[PDB]
A paper describes a structure:
Polar FliL is composed of an N-terminal short cytoplasmic region (residues 1 to 17), a single transmembrane region (TM) (residues 18 to 40), and a periplasmic region (FliLPeri) (residues 41 to 167). FliLPeri shows a remarkable structural similarity to the stomatin/prohibitin/flotillin/HflK/C (SPFH) domain of stomatin family proteins, some of which are involved in modulation of ion channel activities in various organisms.
The FliLPeri crystal belongs to the space group of P42212 and contains 20 molecules in an asymmetric unit. FliLPeri is 17 residues longer at its N terminus than FliLC, but these residues are invisible in the electron density map of FliLPeri. Therefore, we determined the structure of FliLPeri with the same region as that of FliLC. FliLPeri forms a head-to-head stack of two decameric rings in the crystal asymmetric unit. The bean-shaped subunits are vertically arranged in a parallel manner in the ring. The N terminus locates near the ring-to-ring interface and points toward the outer side of the ring. The C terminus of each subunit is arranged on the inner surface of the ring on the opposite side of the ring-to-ring interface. The side-by-side subunit interaction in the ring is primarily hydrophobic.
Author numbering:
A (entry chain F), E (entry chain J), F (entry chain A), G (entry chain B), I (entry chain D), J (entry chain E), ...: 60 to 167
B (entry chain G), C (entry chain H), D (entry chain I), H (entry chain C), K (entry chain K), L (entry chain T), ...: 61 to 167
The structure:
Amino acid sequence: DASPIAYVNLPQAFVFNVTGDSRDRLVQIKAQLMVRGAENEELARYHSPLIESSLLSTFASATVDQLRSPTGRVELRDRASEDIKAALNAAVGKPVIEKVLFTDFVIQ
Amino acid sequence: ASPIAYVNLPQAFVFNVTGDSRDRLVQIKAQLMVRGAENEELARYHSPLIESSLLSTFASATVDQLRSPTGRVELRDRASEDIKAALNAAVGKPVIEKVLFTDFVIQ
Amino acid sequence: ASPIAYVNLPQAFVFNVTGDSRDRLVQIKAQLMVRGAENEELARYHSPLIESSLLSTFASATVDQLRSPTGRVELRDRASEDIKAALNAAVGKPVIEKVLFTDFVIQ
Amino acid sequence: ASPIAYVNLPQAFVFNVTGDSRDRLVQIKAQLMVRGAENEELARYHSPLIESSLLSTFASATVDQLRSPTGRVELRDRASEDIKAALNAAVGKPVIEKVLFTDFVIQ
Amino acid sequence: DASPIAYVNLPQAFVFNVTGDSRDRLVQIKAQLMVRGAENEELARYHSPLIESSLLSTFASATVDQLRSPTGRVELRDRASEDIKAALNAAVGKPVIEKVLFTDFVIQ
Amino acid sequence: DASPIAYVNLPQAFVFNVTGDSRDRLVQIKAQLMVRGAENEELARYHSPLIESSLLSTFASATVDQLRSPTGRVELRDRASEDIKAALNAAVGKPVIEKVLFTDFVIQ
Amino acid sequence: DASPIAYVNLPQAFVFNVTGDSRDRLVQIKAQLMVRGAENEELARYHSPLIESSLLSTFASATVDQLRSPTGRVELRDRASEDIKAALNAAVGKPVIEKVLFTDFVIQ
Amino acid sequence: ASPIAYVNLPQAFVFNVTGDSRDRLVQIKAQLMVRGAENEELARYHSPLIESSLLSTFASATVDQLRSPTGRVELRDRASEDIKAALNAAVGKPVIEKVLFTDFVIQ
Amino acid sequence: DASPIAYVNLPQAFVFNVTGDSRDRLVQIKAQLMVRGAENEELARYHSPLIESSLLSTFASATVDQLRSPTGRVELRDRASEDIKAALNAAVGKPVIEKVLFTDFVIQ
Amino acid sequence: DASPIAYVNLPQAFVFNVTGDSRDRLVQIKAQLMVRGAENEELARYHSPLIESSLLSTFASATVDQLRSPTGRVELRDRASEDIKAALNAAVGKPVIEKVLFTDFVIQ
Amino acid sequence: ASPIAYVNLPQAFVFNVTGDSRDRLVQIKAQLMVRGAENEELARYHSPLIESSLLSTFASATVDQLRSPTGRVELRDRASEDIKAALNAAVGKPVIEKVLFTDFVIQ
Amino acid sequence: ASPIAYVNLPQAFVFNVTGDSRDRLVQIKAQLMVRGAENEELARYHSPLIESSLLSTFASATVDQLRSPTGRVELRDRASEDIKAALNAAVGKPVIEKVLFTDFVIQ
Amino acid sequence: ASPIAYVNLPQAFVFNVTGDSRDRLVQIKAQLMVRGAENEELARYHSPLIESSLLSTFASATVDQLRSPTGRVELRDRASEDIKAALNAAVGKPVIEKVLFTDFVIQ
Amino acid sequence: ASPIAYVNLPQAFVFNVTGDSRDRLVQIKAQLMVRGAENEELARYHSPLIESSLLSTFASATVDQLRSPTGRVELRDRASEDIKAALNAAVGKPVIEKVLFTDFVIQ
Amino acid sequence: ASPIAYVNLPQAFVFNVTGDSRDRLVQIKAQLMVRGAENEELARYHSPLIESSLLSTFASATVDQLRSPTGRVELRDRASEDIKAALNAAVGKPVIEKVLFTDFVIQ
Amino acid sequence: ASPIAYVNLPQAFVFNVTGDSRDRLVQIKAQLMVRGAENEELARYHSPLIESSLLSTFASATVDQLRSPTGRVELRDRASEDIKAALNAAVGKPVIEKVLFTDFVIQ
Amino acid sequence: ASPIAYVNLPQAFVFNVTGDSRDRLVQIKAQLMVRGAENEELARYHSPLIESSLLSTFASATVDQLRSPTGRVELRDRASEDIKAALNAAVGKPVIEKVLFTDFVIQ
Amino acid sequence: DASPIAYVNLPQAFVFNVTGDSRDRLVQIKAQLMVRGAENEELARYHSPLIESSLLSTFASATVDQLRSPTGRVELRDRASEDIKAALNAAVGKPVIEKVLFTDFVIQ
Amino acid sequence: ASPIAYVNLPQAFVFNVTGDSRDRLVQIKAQLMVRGAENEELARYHSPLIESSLLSTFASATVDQLRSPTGRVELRDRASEDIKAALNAAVGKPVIEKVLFTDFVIQ
């Protein structure tokens, strides 16, 4: 009965440009948020516009050398998850989420 | 430090880059982050004016402010201060706290 | 002063510029900024005249004016002063305060 | 005179130019600015005749009357008198006051 | 001519082809009927299938250079009106229409 | 003698391939029947399949020059009327229709 | 009585390829049945799947010579009718249709 | 001399048979002609077995047999005897009399 | 002695690539399960996701030459039906199906 | 006492890239979860976002010779299963699934 | 001779007849039997006149006439004559042949 | 002379007439019979005036007139002359020919 | 002989019968039994005439006949013979074989 | 001499008048009769004021006026002049020509 | 020994039986049990005749049989054997095996 | 401003008043007559407060006032002055000109 | 000088009060009048608590109060100050300014 | 500063009878819950079938004079709250709700 | 222990109990409170057996028990043990933990 895991769905997928090597490509990322506790579930859901901002800002600084690599995608989640906590810690004083989950990842 | 509230701007801003031979379009989906139930009421009512302040900021953005991480973050700080200055002249008070970009593509 | 109100012109304006290089289509979305319930009523009831006035204003602009930041700002001002000068000759009062552009593409 | 009224012609006037080196289509969307409660009634009833007078005006228009800013204004003036002359010869009254162009593109 | 004016709509536009220079075009004309009197308005609707045919037989005998000229267009509209009157006089003995109105005219 | 005119709709659009010379051009013909008399009206409706068959039989001999001259179209339209009669005249003993009308005629 | 005319509709058009052919040309025939009598109409409807089978056989055996000559169609409508009668004569012991009718015919 | 019944197979049989230089696609729409009421009840229940037997028969044919009308006749008889043999080993009864073809295209 | 035959449907159309991609082709298969007894019919429906999995595993080894020869197609049908039995033999302890039936087989 | 089999569907099909050798290739895997027990069935549904994230992190690290060889997917399913069990063990403390099934696999 | 055709009058005729104990509410549903396609056309278009002549006929019926078979055959054969005379004055043709009673309650 | 046309009055007439003891409730469904397309056009357009003349005539009729079929015909011709006299004063034309009763109950 | 066919008469029959202490409603739902494909064609087309010959027959039956089992059997044959005598006068053929009663209530 | 137009008042007027032995529920359905498009435009817009003037005139009449045929005629001429006097103080113009009664029940 | 199959009769049976004080209202919902695929085909096609033989049998039953449990078994068997006699004369075959009662109420 | 506007109150005003014999319902349908576009904006926005001032006024009405034509006029004039008093205390402006009663039934 | 806003409570308050002769069903529909966008937010969120304090006040009132125009005001003020007492204990703010009654009946 | 207030709606009204001195008067109560904290809002919604039971057991024990007296309803309100807290302390271990609210209360 | 779950029973239990003067209805709305994810599946799948065991317990209780607050508590505890006894005999598990009554009227 310790703080139960809950998943806040970010329904709108993230399309963005990768700063690629002379290749104009689009990356589509469908993500969700893993939280623990009820008041974190309603906080991450209520502040989802700010969370959608932290993710899109993180995905821009990601290189195609970092997206194509499996190890880079793992490091991408860590940096994307930490960037949300830094923004929420400054806005509401709480690190609401505990990690962000990628459920779809294509490079079109 | 009133509770935070987010005002949505539904129409995504579709505009073209600053003078490029390969004519590409920019699509930005934005929202407003306000503090206070009164500012939220003001941010919704004057949102047509806020949308114009965002376009005047986007249409004057350089290529660096569209393809660089530091450039995009500056454009966010650029667009926010433009809105505060525009609303400070219309209603006498800066309504928003900052602008939020939830989608940003160049195609 | 009377409270600020906005009148939305829902249909976007598509028009050809008098360009000399190639064929060009420009799409502009606009709303009206008025003050007072009296002018807000007139702005809606005379939207056909206002939609007509904006189209005649845009058609005279060249592409270089659309890319220069001052060209757009002086086009918005020229568009606003034309609607006022047109509604002054139809009802006797400059209904609107200024024209607001919320989206702008050259394609 | 009487308060102004606007009669909408929902038919979009699509026609082709006397193309210099290629075929090209023009799309015109027009309304009717009339003064009076009886003129508004007359303009809406005889809108087929009014729509016919506009097609005859557009089909006889040069390319200068279509792509020039001054000539496009001339096309509006000539189109108004064609309707006045038609309705005066049909009902005895020049029902409309002037024709308004809400959309004017050349694909 | 003393009766009030009425307008009978022909809702289906007229698609036909005319002999071009060497390639035939495809002309589309949206037309309406102008009548005077409730009796002529009554007949113009009931006999519209015959009126639709008399216009098609008129447009079939048209050429492109006749279409791209003010006189050739006015000649065509006036000829299309007399042909219907001749057709309806032969059927019901009354030229129920005053003239044919052209509301839209494209040629592609 | 002079019965009230009635128009019977043949809803099927006649698409057929004219024996083109330059290329294989299609033909789209939409027809309606002009009859006089209430008995002829329901006879034309009940025998519409037979009347449509008589229209395809006469269109099978149509050449390209047949469908492009206005004199040849009237020549064809008259052959369509007299053939529909002869078919119905030998099937039900009565020439049912008066004329056949063409309300849509394109070639492309 | 007089064995009144009756028409049984075959709603789906017949699409098949001409035999031979330089290429593999497609043709589309929309057919109906013209039966005589109230009992033959019931038989023609209930036995339509077999009647549709008898038409595919007759259709898929026609030459491009036969499908483009206007008299070749006549020799085909009669061949389609005689084949259905022979088929139904062995199925139910009665010739049912007395003829078949074409309402649309294209050679794409 | 039991009553004749027609069991319909809605989904048309789309398959491919290799020619000389073609990835040739064939479409066949078929129905089942049965005799008696018990077989009509059995032909509907055992349709997946019947549809499978038909697909197995068509795949074994060559484009030569699909061209010649005689070859198509011995394709119905080969499809019928295959269906009967398939139902004999499953329910001990040849359920159908003959399989009918209503559509046959090759493009 | 003979249990009643039942047919369990698999509405999923199996789409997969031919393994030999020197000739890059795509094949679509629609299958149905043939079982006996009401208990096996109940089992085949409940374990359909497992049965769908065994078919995909069988379709992975199918060679392009095996998909073309009809003797190889029945070699694949008699193999895919055995793999399903082996799969269900290990999961629930009894071979649920009798054979797999193919109702659509195209190589696009 | 026994734990009957239960299948937990994942309706979202997985779309990703291979890091292809010749060019960028698109893959589509449609998966389902095969659990045992009633508590695990509801655990598999509630933690679907975490499970879908683990399958994506597994499919991304897979190569082309894995996705084109039959046993390469056999190794992929095991790695897909073991990664989910390791993820859920750190999150909820139980290896919920015990295996993952593939019902559709296309590398286009 | 001029094949029989039936023209349906969907309006169920509702009218009152004066009895002795209480007022009687009669309800009649009728049709029209005509011969010839032209008389069938006239019977439909002149239905408001035919419905009028049936009400005038049924309103004069005594309660003893309704509760009597020979009285209803008298009323049935009388309403037909009253329609033939009504249409002879309007179009000069005895359109119908007879009137059919399909339902008859008196309650 | 001219073709007969029937203009239907969809809204039935409900009113009250005083008998001996109670106040009665009458329900009349009426249709107009005209000759000529001109009069059919006027009877439809001037229907509210026609619906007023019928109510002005019905409420002035007694129960002994509504009950007597010989006197009920007098009401039909009385209502017709009242409409003709009314329309002769509004448009100078006796538009209708006669009023028709298609349903008549006396509750 | 000829194939049996049943022609449904969906509009059920509702009529009164003269009792002693009350007028009782009678609701009969009937169908037609025909033999041959042509009689079925006539029974449907001449259905309004057939529905009339039943109302003339049903209304002439006393309560002592409707309650009796034998009374219903003779009424059925009487209603059947009445239709044949009616259709022999109209189209010279006795179309039906016998009338069937599928519902019989007396209230 | 302007063309006649009719303005419909949809919401019926339900009011009370007090007679002997009971109250009275009166229900009047009315339409306006105007001449000219300007009056037609004014009558529709000022209907809430017109509905009030009718209710103010209706609720002030005695039961002997609603029951008398001549009493209703003078009520129309009284209700009409009360509207003209009301609209003379509102917009300085008597808008209507007369009021019409299309349904008049009294319970 | 053919497989069992049930043919439904959806519309229940309503009929009257004579009791001591009143007429008792009986409602019977019934189905048919047949053996064989062909008999099931005839049972549905000859439902109007089977519905006739059932109502003809139910009318011959009294209250002391319906309220008696053993009196309903002989009724179920009488209704069954009476149907077989009706179909032995109609189609030369006894179609059903026996009739089934699923719902049964009185009064 | 000069132009008259009507603000509608769609809620029915149902309330009770104690009479000389029994409690009495009242149903009043009211609308607001304002002058000017700015007043129309306040009247719609402050309808909850205005609806309260009407109920607070109608609650104090006596049965002899609602039935007296002079009383309703005084009540109508008192309900308007009460509304102007409430809006003067809330927004500092007397928004409405008068209150209009379109439907009034006491019962 | 804060803007006024109205928070509606849709579910009308139905409660019972004990009278001299029987119980009386009182039905009150209320709205909330607040000043400030912040107080409008709390009034909506805490409406379940506000609907409770109103019933805790309404159900504790007498019939002599609800029939008194003065006591009805003292109730409206008692309910207004009772809500401030609860919200000053829940969130420490007098969220509302007063309560409004839009309908007040006693059944 | 304890926790933000939240309201959990019990949309099903409570209907029950009480034995009056003359009749069996019917009561109708529509209730809601006031909780503080996001977890208590989550628990009160999930355990609503238990909370609705603790109200019916409490309401059914109340007399008729206890309902008409406003001082008795405040006692019934504060009593129904403690009966829920004791029920949830034994069920889940937390006094989830803070107090019960009454939005509608009639007697018949 | 295992987590708590609630298995709803949508069938409201309607039955009768024998009172001293008449038979009083009883309406009990019940739900199942299970502990364990497996028990939830068993409780849902065995609802027909559970609904059977509840009615066997409800239809056996007396009126003095259903009206007793303490008598209802031991009814809830007895109906709970009745389900556990039945499910232990069928599946060898006491699936439920206790029954919950959500609504309980007797009327």
